[PDB]
């Protein structure tokens, strides 16, 4: 899971 | 002949229209933003998703923000009269009310201006639809355990924006299944397409992201977070991707  | 009924959008014109795909992946290193691993899942997935709704799709792979000006200023210039729709997705890095190009920023409104009811003509009338999955900022939700005046139309009517997130929030992708909003758009376009109204198809996405998506993170700041998507609509009638 990583973020914009 | 028979009593006749317009709450729903002219779906049945020769073409359902285009839908333009702006996956960006790898930006400029002066521009310090990462990788966005995943995004790759997300471009297919629509791109078949689309296709299945009978769209002429384009996808666009790492384009620069005068790219992305360009692309926009030219599909806006197309005849678009024998098409129902438009729908733009864009895949990147953002903040609030802007996407990224791989050099740098783009405002979202200088994208969604090219296809005003006045600025392009033969889309006036016809839903525009743009899917954005970038983030709106950086905040993480926690979550919580369960006189009469009587021939005019407004510049701003007949958008549709589908946001992966809430106003000032960050919005999550995975690396090996791509993007929450994206993976749950396109399962519940492929299920109900046929079935719902638009609005509903979307808040079966808004339930899908909610319910079955949390954040795993060593990072404790960024673990164990929700998501919730934000769908604003300017629309004036029903969309249904099917016809009679």
Same mark, same amino acid.
């Given at each position: 899971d990583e973020v914009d | 002949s028979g009593i006749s009924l317009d709450?729903? #959008? @002219?779906? &049945? #014109?020769?073409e359902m229209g285009l839908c333009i795909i702006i996956n960006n992946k790898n930006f400029h290193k002066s521009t310090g933003m990462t990788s966005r691993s995943g995004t790759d899942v997300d471009a297919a997935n629509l791109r078949e998703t689309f296709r299945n709704l009978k769209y002429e799709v384009r996808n666009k792979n790492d384009l620069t923000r005068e790219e992305i000006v360009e692309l926009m200023r030219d599909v806006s210039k197309? &005849?678009? /009269? @024998?098409? /129902?729709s438009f729908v733009c997705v864009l895949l990147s890095h953002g903040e609030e009310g802007i996407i990224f190009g791989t050099n740098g920023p783009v405002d979202l409104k200088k994208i969604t201006n090219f296809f005003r009811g006045d600025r392009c003509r033969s889309l006036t009338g016809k839903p525009k639809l743009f899917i954005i999955q970038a983030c709106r900022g950086t905040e993480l939700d926690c979550g919580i355990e369960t006189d009469d005046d009587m021939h005019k139309i407004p510049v701003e009517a007949d958008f549709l924006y589908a946001y992966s997130?809430?106003?000032g929030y960050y919005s999550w992708r995975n690396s @090996? &299944?791509? /993007?929450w909003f994206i993976q749950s758009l396109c399962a519940m376009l492929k299920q109900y397409a046929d079935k719902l109204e638009f609005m509903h198809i979307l808040t079966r996405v808004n339930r899908a992201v909610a319910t079955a998506f949390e954040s795993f993170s060593f990072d404790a700041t960024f673990h164990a977070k929700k998501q919730i998507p934000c769908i604003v609509s300017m629309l004036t009638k029903e969309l249904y991707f099917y016809h009679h």
């Open positions: - | 709450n729903s #959008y @002219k779906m &049945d #014109y020769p197309e &005849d678009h /009269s @024998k098409r /129902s997130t809430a106003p @090996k &299944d791509g /993007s």
